[PDB]
Design a protein around this ligand. Structure first.
Ligand SMILES: [Ca+2]
Length: 402
């Protein structure tokens, strides 16, 4: 009774583009191959997955006597994987020149959409992890070293030893235009027990961003996204960077389904304006003439124009711009209050991390990463300070408006 209920197959405003309901008892070979990156391995039979279907789920598993998947490149790492493609040169994590030629096959490769699995994670504990991830298909050159279409998104990479987390990561590899340094988090999930229950994990990948959802609620945002087709890998590991195996076998997890939907009206390629409302007070942010602070209050016809905001992005951080004044919110002079001015976009004091919480948004400064935007003194003006994530005076709603 503690599983999160499966979502419906039909999603309002979307069309289903791909699904595997994983009922078994055989893997659908029109969608998946059961070898892990076999082009890296002189003998690809080592890279074959072990798996079964149980209770409507794919159960990938590693046995105690399973051999390493590709000892000449990855040492004694063990993994059982399926992939939605089979293609030369893909995901050269070792930077080897030793590719083994494959006849290109694409079970499912796509650019953009709403991607979702429902899964119950390994309960073995000890070293190891499971992963749902996507890699660029390198369609530009069909090699590695000259490709710039090599992005990696680890939608789920949760470690067996960290039972209350959801690990999410991304890196562009050879791509100069996506996530050129690793970003990795493993925040605690807001509810539930991922290793004893089914939960829903999803990513919406648009031209603008990657947005990650846990049981249908926003959990993480990465601004910036790959702009080419990507393939999917679902796998489980032990004896890898996530740690040496403990003595509980097999290492296994269960995936109920994978679904991908496409928006009926497509995605925006990039003009949005926002009102910004405080969770605790219900008041809106605006800039008053001849006031060096940022005000909050009820929406009125008098302040409406001054209550509209734009977002801009730099280094993956958010800048907040008042539409009427053209000024950025910043903390350069460290006064305890949010300032507004036409300051350089390169100032870290004007750049903010967006942190989803409980259906709302916190803004955390880049220059001073302990400082969030809040109104905990309720002084009629906007503050920054170190206050807990659970304080509603630090939680904000960005509301799109004309
Ligand atoms: Ca199923």
């Amino acid at each position: 009774a503690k599983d999160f209920p499966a979502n419906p197959i039909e999603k309002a405003g979307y069309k289903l583009d791909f699904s595997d309901e994983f009922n078994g008892p055989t893997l659908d070979r029109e969608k998946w191959t059961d070898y892990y990156l076999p082009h890296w391995c002189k003998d690809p039979e080592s890279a074959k997955a072990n798996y079964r279907f149980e209770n409507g789920s794919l159960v990938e598993y590693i046995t105690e006597d399973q051999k390493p998947w590709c000892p000449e490149h990855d040492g004694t790492v063990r993994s059982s994987a399926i992939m939605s493609f089979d293609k030369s040169w893909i995901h050269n994590f070792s930077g080897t020149t030793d590719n083994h030629e494959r006849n290109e096959w694409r079970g499912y490769t796509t650019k953009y959409g709403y991607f979702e699995i429902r899964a119950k994670l390994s309960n073995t504990g000890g070293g190891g992890h499971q992963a749902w991830w996507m890699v660029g298909m390198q369609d530009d050159t069909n090699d590695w070293f000259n490709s710039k279409q090599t992005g990696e998104i680890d939608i789920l990479e949760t470690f067996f030893s960290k039972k209350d987390t959801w690990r999410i990561a991304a890196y562009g590899w050879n791509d100069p235009n996506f996530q050129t340094s690793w970003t990795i988090s493993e925040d605690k999930v807001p509810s539930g027990d991922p290793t004893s229950e089914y939960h829903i994990y999803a990513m919406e990948w648009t031209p603008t961003a990657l947005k990650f959802y846990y049981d249908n609620e926003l959990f993480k945002v990465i601004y910036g996204s790959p702009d080419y087709e990507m393939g999917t890998i679902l796998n489980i590991y032990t004896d890898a960077g996530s740690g040496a195996h403990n003595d509980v076998w097999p290492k296994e997890w269960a995936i109920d389904y994978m679904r991908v939907w496409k928006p009926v009206d497509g995605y925006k390629e990039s003009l949005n304006n926002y009102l910004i409302r405080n969770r605790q007070t219900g008041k809106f942010l605006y800039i008053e003439e001849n006031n060096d602070k940022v005000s909050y209050g009820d929406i009125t016809l008098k302040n409406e124009k001054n209550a509209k905001w734009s977002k801009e992005y730099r280094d993956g951080y958010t800048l907040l711009k008042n539409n009427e004044t053209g000024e950025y919110l910043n903390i350069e002079n460290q006064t305890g209050y949010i300032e507004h001015g036409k300051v350089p976009k390169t100032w870290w004091s004007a750049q903010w991390s967006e942190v989803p919480v409980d259906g709302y948004t916190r803004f955390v400064n880049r220059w001073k990463p302990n400082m969030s935007i809040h109104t905990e003194s309720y002084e009629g003006v906007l503050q920054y300070g170190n206050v807990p994530n659970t304080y509603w005076t630090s939680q904000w709603q960005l509301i799109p408006v004309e």
